Structure formats: structure tokens, C-alpha cells
Write a protein that binds this DNA or RNA. Structure first.
Ligand SMILES: [Mg+2]
Ligand SMILES: [Mg+2]
Ligand SMILES: [Mg+2]
Ligand SMILES: [Mg+2]
Ligand SMILES: [Mg+2]
Ligand SMILES: [Mg+2]
Ligand SMILES: [Mg+2]
Ligand SMILES: [Mg+2]
Ligand SMILES: [Mg+2]
Ligand SMILES: [Mg+2]
Ligand SMILES: [Mg+2]
Ligand SMILES: [Mg+2]
Ligand SMILES: [Mg+2]
Ligand SMILES: [Mg+2]
Ligand SMILES: [Mg+2]
Ligand SMILES: [Mg+2]
Ligand SMILES: [Mg+2]
Ligand SMILES: [Mg+2]
Ligand SMILES: [Mg+2]
Ligand SMILES: [Mg+2]
Ligand SMILES: [Mg+2]
Ligand SMILES: [Mg+2]
Ligand SMILES: [Mg+2]
Ligand SMILES: [Mg+2]
Ligand SMILES: [Mg+2]
Ligand SMILES: [Mg+2]
Ligand SMILES: [Mg+2]
Ligand SMILES: [Mg+2]
Ligand SMILES: [Mg+2]
Ligand SMILES: [Mg+2]
Ligand SMILES: [Mg+2]
Ligand SMILES: [Mg+2]
Ligand SMILES: [Mg+2]
Ligand SMILES: [Mg+2]
Ligand SMILES: [Mg+2]
Ligand SMILES: [Mg+2]
Ligand SMILES: [Mg+2]
Ligand SMILES: [Mg+2]
Ligand SMILES: [Zn+2]
Ligand SMILES: [Zn+2]
Ligand SMILES: [Zn+2]
Lengths: 25, 81, 96, 153, 214, 91, 98, 127
RNA sequence: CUUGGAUUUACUGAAGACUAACUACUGCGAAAGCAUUUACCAAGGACGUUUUCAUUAAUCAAGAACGAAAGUUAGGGGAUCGAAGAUGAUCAGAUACCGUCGUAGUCUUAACCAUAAACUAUGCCGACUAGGGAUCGGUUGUUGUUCUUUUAUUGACGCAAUCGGCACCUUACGAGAAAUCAAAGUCUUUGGGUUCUGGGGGGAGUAUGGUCGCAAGGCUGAAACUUAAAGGAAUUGACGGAAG
């Protein structure tokens, strides 16, 4: 896939990890 | 040119070189004796003068500074010292 | 430009700084020039130039305030007015 | 109290009898104590002066403008607000102005106004932060605070 | 259904005496009725006619004059000067590459209080012996020429009435003086007053206008 | 020492009201408690009374200003605009 | 690899050049990179230059020209044959076609 | 001599306007468009439709008394193309060949001084 | 959208943007960037200099200033384009390309962000090695040239030198895998000074910790595991809804 969209996919997926981890803050 | 006399360059081509690019660097400027038309008083003036030089007798400007050589006013004759 | 001429007078000549000194110097005729800051009160200003008119002293109106007039004179304080008693190496008197 | 704009007390002489008249003007920003205020048709374009609308060129910033000739000020009286003069119609003796709400109004050119912006502007930029601050704000205005929601009654 | 052209009345357009061929042409308007007169709804019209037509000569083919009607006398329309402009093609033919274009404008009022904006344009001239491809003037010279343009337009307009100026515009008096005045700054070519706009007119004086019509 | 890292004067409000309201308050409340330079005597002795009121301790001149600064940008713009428009009218 | 020493534009000793819109597709293209052609065409086609001169009320009236400067992006120009693909050695030639 | 109108011809790439006014331009004498002569949108700007449009304009001009016109051709201008449409060339030739007399000719396209932003986006219209 | 007069036409007015043509293998700036006039404010390179000081210097972890666009916060503005969104088409399907509307945004004032193929994919200082014609800035000698004004002390142009720039053309002593390079040369005949970075391809700029940020995100940054290639330049062919 396009390198720019692969980075966007990971950025959106990094966003999910942060929100999920925040549950157990 | 593989062989060339670097120690004795032709004085014609030596004079076309930049002032810092001669064998021994030498200024191309000089000092002048300026006769204003109004009176007769020796005043030594640098060729590339940056000052509006005035003669002692009458407060009249002899030269105006420029980018390079100073420009002598009308009626002023110079002789290189 | 006038600032450079005034700075030389402070370095070499004689002067008084302040309203009380300037009025005394106008009374004795020892003043050569009176310099008034831009933000000087008009009542004090119109009185200072009445003393100078009587004393026959030219007055120069500085363009900056008393904060800027002090630092031109090399001072760390405010100068609302000053009088030049002796213009020394400078030629401020010849340029008004 | 109750006003965001400070008020200025300006003393004039009475033209007809030996007496001082103290007027209460809305202070424009830059007006100082001891300043001379000039009011009339022939007054000059200086901050704090009161001029007829026809004597001010387009783009003149003016405050405490009269809605009607001689009502002594109706428009642009709160802190930070002003009126911009848009243009003139000298044949009908009328002037177009822009009000703080953004509305364009046509006023008689003989109506007067005070040059400048009303002082105290920028007041709304700060949060009140407390119910008590609003209590004290309306303590010298009127009984309009606090408001119960009609849906909760 | 009605053929609205049966109710139209034709009027003749007369140019001021500053031009030669004063018979500009014809216009029409709804015929004067009881409610609305034809006269009042007819004044204020602007006609754009080529200056070559107003003078016969084709040397003025690149200038077009706006004429404003401001008095009606029967079937004759008494027009006045409303503006000046160049044709679009003439300007496009003057703006070449490898040269500098310099423009200036100034707002100035005439003797009779006609407020105008006058636009001047000029180009650098290539010398007959010039070898280099381009003809560029240094920005300092262009500032002096631009300054020279403004003070000439200001001088030659405020000292005369609008009618004399109209007689000045036709032979490029101002353009010839700018070229002469800037000779010591930089050689110039195609010095033209490329546009004149009327901004403000004085209070209407029918007697002054009537003198401009014979 | 430095007592607070960032709250500064709004440390009097503790943890209440929200950080955005406290940092917005801090900006405007430093300005309203500052000392400004007097245009009359030249000293930096001008302080606010109520909103729009700015007094000088030295020469006792009071000037009408903004709610939280002696002069707002809008007034400075109007001051130069009026100065400019005054020149044309008076030639 | 690098195809052209000029990078397909005319930017040397410069950081940024403001863009222009292609006449054909309105694509933003830098001013130095755009393929520019200056055209001075007769406003009336040669078939009609006679009858329009006869219909003219002016004896010996010269018809004005139509002056236009056209700006194209790379895709529009190649498609419209404004520029063509040249051989590797012929690309370097930048004199106007004879 | 002749009685002049002004033929304001607006020739875009989707239509062709043949509009004759008086000298002032405030009075319209005849306005026939290429779209009044055809029922297909694709050839509203065709040269054939412009010639028919010009002929109807010339016929209307004759019965009102207009014997000659000045030509002010224009394109769409603005942010769009400055070249005139295909119908502008036909309407001019048709007017000259219809017995009408021709005066001055000028291009009056609205040409900006670098103005507002043009439809299509940064990447243009992709086809 | 239109007989409720659309579109078009002339005249007039109001808003915001933006500075066409002149505009170039031209200029300036550390870079990002900078294009209407004039005024004001403070800078800058080059050139000229028989002025002055005398090693004050070169490159630089840490740390600072600036940093397109987009984006964030709060006011103001909101003409035009226009993410999102809504819509008409096309299609097998089309949330898209195309068309019509359109909100944030686009502009501005105070703060944030600190990223771009932020490119010359090419660090900076110093020396040398090769010819040529153009061009910008400065200086110095000189015309069958035009012009102030009639000429000079006008300005332009022309011919030579030179220093500095933006570039370009030819050659290859020399380099390179080649494409190509006046530097990418003076490198097995290997050392002028100095900063930063890479060590097969992925996993991966991922996880985690730290730090900056209001957020979006920025900086620093692994490992497990997997694989015999991945990749660069060029040649021939094949193919192309590319050109001749
Ligand atoms: Mg969940
Ligand atoms: Mg003091
Ligand atoms: Mg009331
Ligand atoms: Mg209550
Ligand atoms: Mg409630
Ligand atoms: Mg409520
Ligand atoms: Mg209840
Ligand atoms: Mg001169
Ligand atoms: Mg303590
Ligand atoms: Mg390729
Ligand atoms: Mg540079
Ligand atoms: Mg860049
Ligand atoms: Mg760039
Ligand atoms: Mg190109
Ligand atoms: Mg159509
Ligand atoms: Mg149609
Ligand atoms: Mg139809
Ligand atoms: Mg395509
Ligand atoms: Mg330039
Ligand atoms: Mg421009
Ligand atoms: Mg930005
Ligand atoms: Mg941005
Ligand atoms: Mg933004
Ligand atoms: Mg906003
Ligand atoms: Mg749109
Ligand atoms: Mg959509
Ligand atoms: Mg839907
Ligand atoms: Mg659908
Ligand atoms: Mg990066
Ligand atoms: Mg690049
Ligand atoms: Mg040179
Ligand atoms: Mg000699
Ligand atoms: Mg001169
Ligand atoms: Mg000169
Ligand atoms: Mg590796
Ligand atoms: Mg993982
Ligand atoms: Mg945080
Ligand atoms: Mg390959
Ligand atoms: Zn002497
Ligand atoms: Zn004070
Ligand atoms: Zn395109």
C-alpha cells in the first residue's frame, strides 16, 4: 500500500492504543 | 601553457590583474595636489577620498565622495604626487 | 544627529541637569542653550521659555521625552530639562 | 456602578450667567483629567471632542452619537464600542453610520457625537469564574440573576 | 405581443467643441409620458466612442472616450467628458518581453474642481546601437521616473480647466513632456496617458457647459 | 525560588474552574495589575482603578483606558486614524 | 534516476515560485515549470478578412490583433501536443523550433 | 452617415450571445443566443448556431433602423478562459455578410489584475 | 436558475481577498520565503579604501532564534475557492474522478504546533586543477551611438579589464557501477580543518520509558520473530488507452 496511507493507518491505530490504555489510568 | 615565467609576468598583463592578485599586492590609488579655481593653495587629496575635502582659505567643497575615485569639482585641476 | 553633538558637550563641557538648576542658570546669564524634553509640562515649558526670552537664550526642543533625554546624556535617570553652560569640544551652539 | 464604561465629569462655563455647569460624559479611551474638551460645529477632530456628524469625514470613529438632534446621546455608549461614519448626503443633510451591532443607520447631519472609542473595552475577554462574581456584577444593576430554567419548574 | 419599439423616441448625441466631428450618433429612450419625462431618465447616460471617430484621424484609433450626457435640448444631447481609456489590444501590443514596464497614477483636481485619477504608462527604449538582449532599468531610475510622472500630471491638471485639458490630452502633451523630462533619467518609448477617470464633479453649471457647445 | 511552574497569579484559584479558564484568566489578570509608563511624567507608575481607569501615582493624572490595559490596540488604531484624518482636513 | 538536469522547471538560486493555474485543466503549476506559449493571432479568420473589410464603414481600417499568453501544466500540454516526447539526447536542445 | 449600434458578442465555450444595444448600452435592440436556434446543449456554442443567431440579430436590427454596428467581442474572462468561443468568429462574419455595416472592433474580455480563486482545485479537473 | 424576467447589456455602489500582462535558466534573503505606489523604521551582501583592531578564528554535541501548508485556542472578518457533508451523473458497483451547492478552512490580530520530495534527494571553512560566451551588483580605462539642451559636470548605449553572485556551454587531466560530475576531481601514488548519518531486506519509526504539546501530534527509540534476497544504474526485448 501507499507509504503515506500506511503511516495514517498506524497513526489512527496508535490513537486507539492510547484511548484503550487510558481506561486503566 | 605548461611553461611560463611566473617570476617575470608581462607588465601589461600584470596591470590588468586584480589589486590583490599581483605578485606583490599594490594599491592603484595615489595622492593628488588639487588646485581649486578660486585660489592657489596646495591641498593633498587622496584619489579615492571618502570626505568632502575643503580648502583652508575658503570653505568650498573640493571633492565629493563616490563609490570609487572622488569626483573633483569644476575648475579643480589635479597633479599626481 | 543632534544627539551626537549634545553627547560631546556632556563629555567635555559644563552643564546643569534639572528644572531648578536651569532656572538659576537663566537668572545668572550663564546659560548658552536650554533643552526641553517633549513631555515636559506646558506650564513649566511656557515658563522656562519666558525665562529664556528674558535671559536671551536660545531654546532647543528635544524630540524625545525625559526618559530618552536622560539616556542621551549618559545618565541613568530622567532629565526633563537641562542648560548648557559651556559647549566644549562640540559645536552644538552653532547648530541650534 | 452597573456600567462597564467609566464616566467623565467635564466642567463648562455657562454662556449666559456666571455659573459652572458639570456634565457627565461617557469617557472615550485616551481622555485624561485636565484635558480640554471642545463641543460644537466648529470643534476640531481631536479625541474627546463633540462634533456634528456632518463635520466628520468618512471613517471617523465616534461614540455617544445622538439618534435625534438634541437627545444628548443614544448610540455606542458601552465599553469598547463605537460608531463608524460611512458617508454623507449633504443635499438632504443626512449621514450614514455603522452601529456596534453591524447595522447601517441614517441620521441627521446635525446630530452630535464624541470622537473616539468608549473606554473600558475588552471586559468580556475575562471569565467571571464564579457565581459570586456575577452576583456582585448584578448587585448594582437589577434583580435578573440567577435564572431558573423553565424546563425545571 | 406589444412590440416595445413603437413607443421609442430617437435623440441625437452632440459632442463638445473640443473635438471636431461633434455628431457622435443617435440613441433612443422610452417616449416622454405624463408620469415620467424622457429628459430626466436620459441624462447621466455614458457613451464610449473612439477618439479617432471624434477627430477623423486614425492616429487616435487606440483611445476611446466616455461622453456623459447632462443636458437635453429637444432632440439634441449635450454630452461632457466622462473618462479616457485605451483599447485593450493596443495595451497588449505594447507589453513585450525583455523590457521594463513602469506605471504611475495620481489623484488631482482641476481648476474647476473636477477630481480625476490619471494613469500614465511608459516603457524602456532600446538604443539604436544597443547589443544586449534585454532593456531593463534599475529600480532606482524607475522610482525617479515614477516620481517624475506624478509631478507632471499634478502640474498640468491643477493649472487648467477641464476643457483645456481635453485639448491637451488629444496630442499627448503630458506624454511628450514626460518623455522630455525623463531624458536625463532613462530613454523612454511609448509614453502615454493610458486612462483617465472622472471621480468627482463640481456643482452643475449649465452656462459653463453651454459655452462648450457653441 | 520559582514557586509555581505555570499557574503564576492564578494559583490563588487552586484547582477550580478548569485549566482553560484559568490560563485565559492569567493572561488578562497580569495585564490589569501591571504598572504602565505615564505619557505625562515618564515614570512607570500607572495602575488601574476600576475598568477603564488608569491612574499615575506621581503626577496624579488619570486617563481613561481599557478594562485590562491602559491602551487597547483598537484605540491606538483610532488614535493614528484620527491623527491622519485630521491632517487632511486641516491641510 | 535523475531524468533532467533542470528538474523540469526553471528554478535556480531560488526557494519558491508562486503558482499559476493551467488554462486547460486549472492545475496549480509553478510559474517557472509551466510550458508557456505566446500567441498573436488575427482576430478574424483569413476567409472573412475580405468581406469584413468591404463591409467596413472605414476606408483602410486595420483589423486589431488578438494578444494572449497561454499557461499549461505538463499533463495538458503533453496531451494537447504543445510539447512532445523527445529522444534522450534531443531533450537538451532548448532553442525554439525553426 | 450610418446609424450605429453596438454588437456586444459574448462567446463562451457553452453558448454564444449576440447582443446589440444602442451607443450607451442601456437600451437593448436585439438579443439572440445560439441556444435559441438549436435544441441540443452540445452545439449551443457551435459556429452554425452563431451564424443563425447573428442573422436573426441583423434582421431585427434592420426593421428598427440600425444600419451599422460596432463590435465588442468578449470571452468568459474572470477566473476562466480568456479565449473567445467558437461562435464569436461566425457571428461576426454573418453580421458582415448580412448587409450590415461594420464599425470599430475591440476585444472587451474582463481581464483581472490577479483576482479570486478559480474552480477546479489544486490538482485541476482530472479526466 | 427562469414571463414572479433568468442569462445578457450600460451606469452605480459594497465587501473581502489577490497584485495579471512587464516576469527572464534575472534579483534579494540563513532557510521557510519575497512582486501595486508612496511615506516612515531598523537592517544586509558585494564593490571601493595607502581607514581601524591585531588571531579576535573554522566547524560545532547541549542549548537557542526562525521555520510553507495544513491544523489548534480566542476575537475580528467571512469576497472567492473549498476538506467534511449534501446532491446530479457515470458504473456491474461506485461513498470517487466530472457537475451543482456547500461547513470548517482560506484573510487578519494575539497565542500554539515544529512538520514537507522543508530537494541541489549533494554539510561548512580553506587551497589548487580548464577553456568559452552570456548575465546581475560594484569599481577602473576607452566610442562611426542616441539624448539633456546647445554641449558638457546629464543619463543611456558600446568596447575592454577586473572582484563578487544566479546560471549556462564544451572537454575529460581526473572520478564513478553507470546515469552522470568544474565537482561527485587533487582517493591503494590511500592523511588540509571540522559537524552529522548508514552497516542485507522486513518486522518498524512499531512496542515501551522519558520529554515537549490544549489536541492533532513532535523528539528520542527497541526486541521477539521472519527471509535469500530486496535494491541501484544501464542493455536487449515485450508491452503502453505516449509522441513522430
Ligand atoms: Mg472498548
Ligand atoms: Mg524626570
Ligand atoms: Mg436616551
Ligand atoms: Mg434573585
Ligand atoms: Mg439555570
Ligand atoms: Mg438560561
Ligand atoms: Mg419540578
Ligand atoms: Mg538624475
Ligand atoms: Mg519560599
Ligand atoms: Mg521515469
Ligand atoms: Mg541566495
Ligand atoms: Mg521550499
Ligand atoms: Mg519549494
Ligand atoms: Mg518547463
Ligand atoms: Mg451550453
Ligand atoms: Mg446553455
Ligand atoms: Mg431551446
Ligand atoms: Mg487525463
Ligand atoms: Mg528585478
Ligand atoms: Mg502589477
Ligand atoms: Mg504557518
Ligand atoms: Mg499555516
Ligand atoms: Mg491557519
Ligand atoms: Mg476565527
Ligand atoms: Mg463553488
Ligand atoms: Mg462529497
Ligand atoms: Mg446520503
Ligand atoms: Mg449514488
Ligand atoms: Mg524530517
Ligand atoms: Mg526542487
Ligand atoms: Mg559589470
Ligand atoms: Mg588609463
Ligand atoms: Mg541631471
Ligand atoms: Mg543622473
Ligand atoms: Mg539494516
Ligand atoms: Mg508490534
Ligand atoms: Mg499534555
Ligand atoms: Mg532500474
Ligand atoms: Zn581654495
Ligand atoms: Zn505621571
Ligand atoms: Zn493543466
Amino acid at each position: 500500500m501507499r507509504d503515506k496511507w500506511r503511516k495514517k493507518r498506524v497513526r489512527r491505530l496508535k490513537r486507539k492504543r492510547r484511548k484503550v490504555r487510558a481506561r486503566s489510568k | 601553457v605548461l611553461v611560463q615565467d611566473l617570476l617575470h609576468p608581462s607588465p601589461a598583463t600584470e596591470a590588468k590583474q586584480h589589486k590583490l592578485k599581483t605578485l606583490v599586492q599594490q594599491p592603484r590609488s595615489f595622492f593628488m595636489d588639487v588646485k581649486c579655481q578660486g585660489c592657489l593653495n596646495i591641498t593633498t587629496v587622496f584619489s579615492h577620498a571618502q570626505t568632502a575635502v575643503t580648502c583652508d582659505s575658503c570653505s568650498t567643497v573640493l571633492c565629493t565622495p563616490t563609490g570609487g575615485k572622488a569626483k573633483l569639482t569644476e575648475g579643480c585641476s589635479f597633479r599626481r604626487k | 544627529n543632534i544627539n551626537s553633538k549634545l553627547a560631546l558637550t556632556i563629555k567635555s563641557g559644563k552643564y546643569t541637569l534639572g528644572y531648578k538648576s536651569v532656572v538659576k542658570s537663566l537668572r545668572t546669564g550663564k546659560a548658552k542653550l536650554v533643552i526641553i524634553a517633549a513631555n515636559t509640562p506646558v506650564l513649566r515649558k511656557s515658563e522656562l521659555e519666558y525665562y529664556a526670552m528674558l535671559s536671551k537664550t536660545p531654546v532647543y526642543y528635544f524630540q524625545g521625552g525625559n526618559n530618552e533625554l536622560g539616556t542621551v546624556c549618559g545618565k541613568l535617570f530622567r532629565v526633563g530639562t537641562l542648560s548648557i553652560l559651556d559647549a566644549g569640544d562640540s559645536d552644538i551652539l552653532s547648530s541650534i | 456602578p452597573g456600567r462597564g464604561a467609566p464616566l467623565a465629569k467635564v466642567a463648562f462655563r455657562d454662556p449666559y450667567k456666571y455659573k459652572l455647569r458639570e456634565e457627565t460624559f461617557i469617557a472615550n479611551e485616551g481622555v485624561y483629567t485636565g484635558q480640554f474638551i471642545y463641543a460644537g460645529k466648529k470643534a476640531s477632530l481631536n479625541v474627546g471632542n463633540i462634533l456634528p456628524l456632518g463635520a466628520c469625514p468618512e471613517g471617523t470613529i465616534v461614540s455617544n452619537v445622538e439618534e435625534k438632534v438634541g437627545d444628548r446621546g443614544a448610540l455606542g455608549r458601552t465599553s469598547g464600542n463605537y460608531v463608524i461614519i460611512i458617508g454623507h448626503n449633504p443635499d438632504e443633510n443626512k449621514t450614514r453610520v455603522k452601529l456596534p451591532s453591524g447595522a447601517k443607520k441614517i441620521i441627521s447631519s446635525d446630530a452630535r457625537g464624541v470622537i473616539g472609542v468608549v473606554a473600558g473595552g475588552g471586559r468580556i475577554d475575562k471569565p467571571l469564574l464564579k457565581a459570586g462574581r456575577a452576583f456582585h456584577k448584578y448587585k448594582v444593576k437589577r434583580n435578573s440573576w440567577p435564572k431558573t430554567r423553565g424546563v425545571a419548574m | 405581443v406589444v412590440d416595445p419599439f413603437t413607443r421609442k423616441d430617437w435623440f441625437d448625441i452632440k459632442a463638445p467643441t473640443t473635438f471636431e466631428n461633434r455628431n457622435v450618433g443617435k440613441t433612443l429612450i422610452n417616449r416622454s409620458t405624463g408620469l415620467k419625462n424622457a429628459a430626466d431618465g436620459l441624462k447621466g447616460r455614458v457613451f464610449e466612442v473612439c477618439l479617432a471617430d471624434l477627430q477623423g484621424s486614425e492616429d487616435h484609433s487606440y483611445r476611446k472616450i466616455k461622453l456623459r450626457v447632462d443636458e437635453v435640448q429637444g432632440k439634441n444631447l449635450l454630452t461632457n467628458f466622462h473618462g479616457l481609456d485605451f483599447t485593450s489590444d493596443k495595451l497588449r501590443s505594447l507589453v513585450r518581453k525583455w523590457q521594463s514596464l513602469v506605471e504611475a497614477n495620481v489623484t488631482v483636481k482641476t481648476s474647476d474642481d473636477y477630481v480625476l485619477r490619471v494613469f500614465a504608462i511608459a516603457f524602456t527604449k532600446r538604443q539604436p546601437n544597443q547589443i544586449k538582449k534585454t532593456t531593463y532599468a534599475q529600480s532606482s531610475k524607475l522610482r525617479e521616473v515614477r516620481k517624475k510622472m506624478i509631478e507632471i500630471m499634478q502640474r498640468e491638471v491643477s493649472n487648467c480647466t477641464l476643457a483645456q485639458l481635453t485639448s491637451k490630452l488629444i496630442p499627448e502633451v503630458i506624454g511628450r513632456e514626460i518623455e522630455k523630462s525623463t531624458q536625463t533619467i532613462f530613454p523612454l518609448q511609448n509614453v502615454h496617458i493610458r486612462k483617465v477617470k472622472l471621480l468627482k464633479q463640481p456643482k452643475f453649471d449649465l452656462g459653463s457647459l453651454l459655452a462648450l457647445h457653441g | 525560588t520559582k514557586r509555581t511552574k505555570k499557574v503564576g497569579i492564578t494559583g490563588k484559584f487552586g484547582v477550580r474552574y478548569g485549566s482553560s479558564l484559568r490560563r485565559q484568566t492569567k493572561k488578562l489578570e497580569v495585564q490589569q495589575h501591571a504598572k504602565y509608563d505615564c505619557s505625562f511624567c515618564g515614570k512607570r507608575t500607572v495602575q488601574r482603578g476600576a475598568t477603564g481607569i488608569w491612574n499615575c501615582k506621581s503626577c496624579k493624572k488619570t486617563v481613561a483606558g481599557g478594562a485590562y490595559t491602559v491602551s487597547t490596540a483598537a484605540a491606538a488604531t483610532v488614535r493614528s486614524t484620527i491623527r491622519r484624518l485630521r491632517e487632511l482636513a486641516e491641510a | 534516476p535523475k531524468k533532467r538536469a533542470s528538474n523540469g522547471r526553471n528554478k535556480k538560486g531560488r526557494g519558491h515560485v508562486k503558482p499559476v493555474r493551467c488554462l486547460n485543466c486549472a492545475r496549480c503549476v509553478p510559474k517557472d515549470k509551466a510550458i508557456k506559449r505566446v500567441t498573436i493571432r488575427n482576430m478574424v479568420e483569413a476567409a472573412a478578412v475580405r468581406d469584413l473589410s468591404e463591409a467596413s464603414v472605414y476606408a483602410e481600417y486595420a483589423l486589431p490583433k488578438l494578444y494572449n499568453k497561454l499557461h499549461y501544466c505538463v499533463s495538458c500540454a503533453i496531451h494537447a501536443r504543445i510539447v512532445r516526447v523527445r529522444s534522450r539526447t534531443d531533450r537538451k536542445i532548448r532553442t525554439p523550433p525553426q | 452617415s450610418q446609424v450605429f449600434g453596438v454588437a456586444r458578442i459574448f462567446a463562451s465555450f457553452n453558448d454564444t450571445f449576440v447582443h446589440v444595444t444602442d451607443l450607451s448600452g442601456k437600451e437593448t435592440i436585439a438579443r439572440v443566443t445560439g441556444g435559441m436556434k438549436v435544441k441540443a446543449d452540445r452545439d449551443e456554442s457551435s459556429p452554425y448556431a452563431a451564424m443563425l443567431a447573428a442573422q436573426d440579430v441583423a434582421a431585427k436590427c434592420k426593421e428598427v433602423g440600425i444600419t451599422a454596428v460596432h463590435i465588442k467581442l468578449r470571452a468568459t474572462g474572470g477566473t476562466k478562459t480568456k479565449t473567445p468561443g467558437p461562435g464569436g468568429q461566425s457571428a461576426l462574419r454573418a453580421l458582415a455578410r448580412s448587409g450590415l455595416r461594420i464599425g470599430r472592433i475591440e476585444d472587451v474580455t474582463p481581464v483581472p489584475s490577479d483576482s479570486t480563486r478559480r474552480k477546479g482545485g489544486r490538482r485541476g479537473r482530472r479526466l
